[PDB]
Amino acid sequence: SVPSQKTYQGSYGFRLGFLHSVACTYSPALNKMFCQLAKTCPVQLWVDSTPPPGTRVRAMAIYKQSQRMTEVVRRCPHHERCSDGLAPPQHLIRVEGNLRVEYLDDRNTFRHSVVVPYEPPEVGSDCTTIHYNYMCNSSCMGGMNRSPILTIITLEDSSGNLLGRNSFEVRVCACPGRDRRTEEENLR
């Protein structure tokens, strides 16, 4: 199967925002994050009303291209062998700066995902920020090998039921800023 990427703002009005970290930069035009391997990628959760406690936030990668859409995205054999003792070595996406990160493997599809409890916004902020880290380069042969991926962020209840969904393309690369410019120029 292929995980849905259909935007679903849902009853809480769930949207994503993005911040400069260049460790991490987001193109609204491309709906695409460009980021460096292992660096901080701040992703903002915006809601119109507050989800209940017990609400959870999952991140999962999938291949964008139809020829690989059913394939599990995971770290290349090299980077697998390179943890914090939290993230399983195979998992492409980690969360940093959170004591309650769950690393999950689907029973049926073998897809990886990383889940944290939903927290309402901190002081000074209208949104909740999660700091992801991507642990393998888009160009790694024997992994992504240049195939684009999407990260899907799902808001869920405690039983795993869908409350909201949004998604963004990701390229993990040496110079996010330069690569963003190159891809945005190919637009005009």
Binding site for Zn ion (CB under 5 A): 76, 79, 136, 140, 143
Four-residue CA torsion sign, 36, 136, 100, 28: positive
For residue 178, give the 3-state DSSP assignment: helix
78 belongs to an annotated ligand binding site: no
Between 146 and 178, CB nearer to Zn ion: 146
Residues whose CB falls within 8 Å of the CB of residue 162, separated by 6 or more in sequence, listed in order? 8, 10, 154, 155, 156
24 assigned to a ligand binding site: no
Q: Closest approach of Cβ 97 to Zn ion, in Å?
A: 23
| Residue 172 Cβ vs Zn ion, minimum distance, rounded to whole Å | 9
The annotation status of 79 as a binding-site residue, yes or no, is yes
CB nearer to Zn ion: give 117 or 148: 148
> What totals of helices (H) and strands (E) does the chain contain, helices first?
2, 11
Closest approach of Cβ 96 to Zn ion, in Å?
Answer: 18
The span from the CA of 183 to the CA of 104, in Å, is 33
Angle at 111 between CA 105 and CA 113, to 5 degrees: 65
Closer CB to Zn ion, 62 or 76, in the complex: 76
To the nearest whole angstrom, how small is the minimum distance from the Cβ of residue 79 to Zn ion? 4
Residues forming the annotated binding site?
76, 79, 136, 140
Residues forming the annotated binding site for Zn(2+)?
76, 79, 136, 140
